[PDB]
Amino acid sequence: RHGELQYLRQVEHILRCGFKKEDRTGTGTLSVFGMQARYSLRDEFPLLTTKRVFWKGVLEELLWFIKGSTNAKELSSKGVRIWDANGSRDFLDSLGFSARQEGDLGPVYGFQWRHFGAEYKDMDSDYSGQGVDQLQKVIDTIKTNPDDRRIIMCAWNPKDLPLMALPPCHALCQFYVVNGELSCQLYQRSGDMGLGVPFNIASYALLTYMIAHITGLQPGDFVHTLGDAHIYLNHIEPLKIQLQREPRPFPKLKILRKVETIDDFKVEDFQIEGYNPHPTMEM
Amino acid sequence: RHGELQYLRQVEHILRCGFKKEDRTGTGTLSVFGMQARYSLRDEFPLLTTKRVFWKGVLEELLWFIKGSTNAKELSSKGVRIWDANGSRDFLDSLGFSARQEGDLGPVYGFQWRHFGAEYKDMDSDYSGQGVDQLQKVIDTIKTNPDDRRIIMCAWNPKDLPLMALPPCHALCQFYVVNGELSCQLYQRSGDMGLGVPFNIASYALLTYMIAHITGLQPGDFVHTLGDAHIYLNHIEPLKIQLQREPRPFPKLKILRKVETIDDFKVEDFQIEGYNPHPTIKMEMA
Ligand SMILES: O=c1nc(NO)ccn1[C@H]1C[C@H](O)[C@@H](COP(=O)(O)O)O1
Numbered sequence: 001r002h003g004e005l006q007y008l009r010q011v012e013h014i015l016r017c018g019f020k021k022e023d024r025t026g027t028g029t030l031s032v033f034g035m036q037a038r039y040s041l042r043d044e045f046p047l048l049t050t051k052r053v054f055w056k057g058v059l060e061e062l063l064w065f066i067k068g069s070t071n072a073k074e075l076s077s078k079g080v081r082i083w084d085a086n087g088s089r090d091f092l093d094s095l096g097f098s099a100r101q102e103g104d105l106g107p108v109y110g111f112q113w114r115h116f117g118a119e120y121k122d123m124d125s126d127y128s129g130q131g132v133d134q135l136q137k138v139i140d141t142i143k144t145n146p147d148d149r150r151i152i153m154c155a156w157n158p159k160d161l162p163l164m165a166l167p168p169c170h171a172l173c174q175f176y177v178v179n180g181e182l183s184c185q186l187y188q189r190s191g192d193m194g195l196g197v198p199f200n201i202a203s204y205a206l207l208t209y210m211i212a213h214i215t216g217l218q219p220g221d222f223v224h225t226l227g228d229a230h231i232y233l234n235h236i237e238p239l240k241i242q243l244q245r246e247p248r249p250f251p252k253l254k255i256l257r258k259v260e261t262i263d264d265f266k267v268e269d270f271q272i273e274g275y276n277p278h279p280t281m282e283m
Numbered sequence: 284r285h286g287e288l289q290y291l292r293q294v295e296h297i298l299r300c301g302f303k304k305e306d307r308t309g310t311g312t313l314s315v316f317g318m319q320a321r322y323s324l325r326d327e328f329p330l331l332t333t334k335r336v337f338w339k340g341v342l343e344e345l346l347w348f349i350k351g352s353t354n355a356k357e358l359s360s361k362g363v364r365i366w367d368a369n370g371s372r373d374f375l376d377s378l379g380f381s382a383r384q385e386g387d388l389g390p391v392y393g394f395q396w397r398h399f400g401a402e403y404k405d406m407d408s409d410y411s412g413q414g415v416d417q418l419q420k421v422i423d424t425i426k427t428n429p430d431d432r433r434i435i436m437c438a439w440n441p442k443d444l445p446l447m448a449l450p451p452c453h454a455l456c457q458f459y460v461v462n463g464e465l466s467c468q469l470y471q472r473s474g475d476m477g478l479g480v481p482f483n484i485a486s487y488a489l490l491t492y493m494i495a496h497i498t499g500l501q502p503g504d505f506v507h508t509l510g511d512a513h514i515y516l517n518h519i520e521p522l523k524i525q526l527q528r529e530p531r532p533f534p535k536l537k538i539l540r541k542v543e544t545i546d547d548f549k550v551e552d553f554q555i556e557g558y559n560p561h562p563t564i565k566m567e568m569a
Pocket residue numbers: 024167169170190191192193195196197200432433
């Protein structure tokens with residue numbers, strides 16, 4: 001009944017039925033290919049309670065995508081340092097991006113969402129009016145033709161892949177309207193169940209709350225679809241302890257004023273209410 | 284537990300729990316957003332048995348994608364007419380492409396799979412060496428780095444959307460290797476459960492058979508993920524008839540020689556063995 005039970009049941013499934021599968025680093029995982037969960041967004045927000053999620057992170061990252069930034073420093077400046085390693089001098093240099101300034105992640109989410117198909121130069125270039133503004137397109141469609149079955153925002157851009165500091169885990173999302181309610185489905189190609197997935201659910205849930213607010217709809221479901229769902233072998237023992245915790249009721253997300261456009265949202269517009277995660281995993 | 288039961292349980296779910304949702308066509312639907320089924324490809328091929336699926340069409344269509352064609356006439360010449368209406372004068376005209384030659388679907392699957400990001404001109408243009416050959420990239424990666432979590436072919440191209448005769452229902456697919464087995468997940472954004480979906484499952488299961496053959500792996504699973512899964516209101520009675528039929532075991536798919544490149548497959552190289560479906564059920568197209 002509690003929606004977090006689906007996440008825990010996925011983790012239980014990978015622990016019990018997953019296959020050992022080597023991976024790009026070399027730490028090894030247990031893996032299952034193809035999973036799906038549905039998190040209701042109706043009068044609650046799916047911010048996992050069996051372990052704390054970095055909400056400040058979720059929110060600032062999402063605001064950073066929306067402004068179309070591809071500078072890790074513009075995020076880091078908000079106290080959210082999750083993308084900093086990927087834009088470091090040594091990391092960029094290792095990919096052959098010696099000409100880039102530190103921070104320049106290349107044409108990642110912000111760019112694809114706002115400027116798909118534009119020619120990326122650097123993180124400081126002016127791309128005003130260039131490419132497809134997928135995010136505004138989705139919002140426009142939801143308002144004018146909510147029954148449309150093509151309401152997609154796609155970060156996966158095969159042309160641009162070699163220029164990105166890393167390829168996106170969240171390949172595309174799709175939006176859906178029925179009965180005054182906005183749903184979102186994420187196709188996530190690769191999910192670290194222990195460390196990444198709870199954050200990723202909160203992210204796409206928050207986007208859906210944001211879009212539903214500006215289009216005058218209510219949040220429906222967040223449908224989480226995974227490709228390689230995995231648990232790193234060093235996360236097994238912590239997840240078994242986590243798996244013994246009963247979820248606390250999900251918190252509520254409140255939007256504190258009437259916001260007209262997606263660009264106008266600010267950190268202060270949001271309040272998480274009644275979040276009571278169980279107390280205290282390496283990447 | 285017969286794999287076709289998942290498809291039938293999806294249809295039953297939509298019939299029972301779907302919402303009525305108007306659509307672009309005006310016929311209306313019952314719809315659910317977000318579904319997933321897994322079809323084993325291990326010593327069986329998921330060609331549905333509760334009605335007859337147009338296998339010839341599945342095979343010719345996929346071959347046609349593979350060679351990069353965006354010319355409906357080139358598929359029609361094989362006796363497979365499923366794209367002809369999309370390339371017709373009247374339809375191209377309605378979309379505003381009156382300068383376009385009849386048959387010219389614009390930058391659809393074949394172009395995206397073989398030339399992603401190239402500048403489309405017309406269906407007769409020479410695109411050799413232009414854009415990203417995603418199909419070949421996926422094959423290459425499967426061979427050189429089977430654990431890669433980025434093995435994706437994406438037909439959804441927001442830049443090209445406005446030039447396409449129709450936007451792709453199959454937005455992307457991802458491949459996955461473990462234990463000597465090749466799996467594929469399709470993200471299908473919109474599924475006509477009556478007419479489209481059984482054909483679509485066969486398409487991607489066949490694609491997976493083809494790639495596993497080329498990369499020397501065994502087919503694993505086909506995971507079918509749907510966005511707007513819908514039943515047109517006029518398919519309801521035909522599907523209620525179908526839901527009464529008990530599935531028969533799935534057929535086997537045989538590949539009849541060693542093929543070394545995906546471009547070298549021909550219709551003659553495939554044999555469906557033991558396909559014993561219940562009769563065709565006819566359903567009016569939206
Ligand atoms: O769960 C994840 N969520 C992300 N959100 O931005 C990013 C990454 N991941 C995980 C999935 C894999 O563990 C790893 C990415 O490695 P890849 O799948 O090899 O590209 O990080």
